[PDB]
Design a protein around this ligand. Structure first.
Ligand SMILES: CCC(=O)Nc1cc(Cl)c(Oc2ccc(O)c(-c3ccc(NC(N)=O)cc3)c2)c(Cl)c1
Ligand SMILES: CCC(=O)Nc1cc(Cl)c(Oc2ccc(O)c(-c3ccc(NC(N)=O)cc3)c2)c(Cl)c1
Lengths: 296, 297
């Protein structure tokens, strides 16, 4: 069974990595690019970008541990722990050559440690729409002069007593529509049909719980990254961020400059957090062009 | 049926104010003191202070509009709108002399504008455990190195789509326990019975909604307060804050110094946000002494 429609010419498969069965969708030929989704979503956010990339690359899009059709991690949900699964997965398909990485939202949290610890394995890097976990996150406001802030949910999701699961169970579809639209500029792309697909996936009890465990591990990931960040990333990197409602704006690039020697950033006007869906045409173009500067 | 037990010598009653039927509990003799509760609670949070205060004052503790047994406001939930109801209520009982005001939590939001606009009517002022709504609240962090912050609910409650009502309905008792205890140092004071009573009250559908409408009007209250604050408060003022887990610490006094010419403050070590229940004896003492420095029975 498949929670989301696989693009024509792609395969949906699973790979056991350190005792954890990871789901992925794969297609294309050439050097490997791994695309890693974020919260509220699955590999499917990449489905419009994938066929295009697959003309020039071998493309893999896994589900994060516990999310989509992937088993929960057995170690834990901190960025360093999860990154091990993603690194080993990628290296199964690219054992003797470096691969490209594109990551959105908590996909960043879950890949940053494997990038910094295995720099020679990463040819080119694209990060969009989430802070790398560090002390900067403790500066984001709980509340703004415009109303609900960007990251108040960090505390909601991290709260003890399974507060978030207890409140959200049974109302996953309602909550996700609010969460996604509140972080979007172009809300119109989130049709009821699309929201139904995403909500059905994260409503699996283990997936709802897994989603929040990433936030419950956030302070641990910050602590991990404080050590790792002592060495800057050396490979070509690009950041994207939305400039519209719900987007990270100039923060994405400004933070990355502290982490990378070689970085170019773009802020996409009229787009919020959900770049692949809100602004598919310019986002896809930026990613393809950036990755195509290397071998393909 | 009363939602909460009335202390001996007090009466539970109602007054219409601007077309809104307000509930209050009243007792004592002497100059008036009005005690205004906050979120998650009702007049009942004052039930331990009331009998002691009633020895020297006439004491009134209303339910905020939409909460407890009070009807919703007919105008709106912004601080300036809600304060009108509280001001006019107090004036019905103290038309000829100024009265004292004690407010906790969002009681502060709902009283500040009437205090600054009718300074002649306010003899002495006590504020505890809540910021006056102003730009300072936009600085509180969403998330901390220790985890769940104390202020993330500002956004949760202010959110549209009836986000909070929709998620909390059916789980009111569970949510309230988490909210109260996560802002407490002394969680033991919140018995199953006490939480049951508070949960049942705020779970009334118009009350659950009222609770969050206070937050949906918070930015408007901030905008209102920006203009009102051009005039400093001149009455004797005391701030109280908890110094333990969940408390506001030095913020209460430090914010108030920007608003008030004549202010003294205390931070209570070992106490969190819910001062009247977590730290009833010293809070009661400080309030009683501060108010008793003025004319009383
Ligand atoms: C330097 C001063 C400063 O900090 N300004 C400032 C204020 C706010 Cl309120 C703010 O909030 C935002 C804005 C856009 C976002 O996409 C997000 C955002 C990003 C990622 C996730 N993903 C996840 N899984 O929760 C969720 C939300 C948050 C930012 Cl970035 C900066
Ligand atoms: C060290 C420098 C500094 O400025 N620290 C600092 C940080 C924060 Cl985050 C902060 O805000 C707080 C702290 C504790 C609280 O219980 C609350 C609080 C207050 C009122 C309600 N009530 C309602 N109904 O929502 C609920 C919670 C707010 C203050 Cl005042 C100071």
């Amino acid at each position: 069974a498949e929670e989301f429609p696989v693009p024509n010419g792609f395969e949906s498969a699973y790979r056991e990595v350190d005792g954890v069965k990871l789901h992925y969708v794969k297609g294309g030929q050439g050097p490997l690019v791994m695309l890693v989704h974020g919260f509220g979503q699955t590999w499917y956010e990449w489905h419009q970008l994938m066929p295009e990339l697959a003309k020039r690359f071998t493309v893999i899009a896994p589900d994060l541990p516990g999310l989509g059709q992937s088993e929960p991690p057995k170690t834990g949900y901190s960025g360093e722990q999860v990154a091990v699964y993603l690194h080993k997965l990628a290296r199964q398909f690219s054992p003797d050559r470096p691969f490209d990485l594109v990551a959105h939202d908590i996909g960043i949290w879950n890949t940053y440690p494997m990038v910094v610890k295995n720099q020679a394995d990463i040819a080119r890097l694209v990060y969009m729409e989430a802070p790398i976990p560090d002390a900067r996150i403790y500066r984001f406001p709980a509340f703004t002069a415009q109303g609900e802030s960007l990251v108040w949910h960090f505390s909601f999701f991290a709260a003890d007593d399974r507060l978030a699961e207890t409140l959200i169970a049974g109302k996953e579809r309602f909550f996700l529509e609010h969460f996604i639209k509140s972080h979007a500029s172009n809300t119109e792309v989130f049709s009821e049909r699309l929201l139904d697909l995403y909500a059905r996936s994260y409503a699996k009890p283990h997936s709802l719980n897994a989603s929040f465990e990433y936030y419950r591990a956030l302070n641990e990931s910050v602590r991990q990254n404080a050590e790792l960040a002592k060495t800057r990333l050396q490979m070509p990197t690009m950041t994207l961020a939305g400039g519209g409602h719900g987007g990270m704006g100039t923060f994405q690039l400004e933070q990355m400059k502290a982490y990378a020697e070689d970085v170019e950033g773009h802020v996409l006007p009229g787009c919020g957090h959900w770049l692949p869906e809100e602004c598919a045409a310019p986002m896809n173009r930026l990613v393809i062009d950036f990755l195509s500067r290397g071998r393909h």
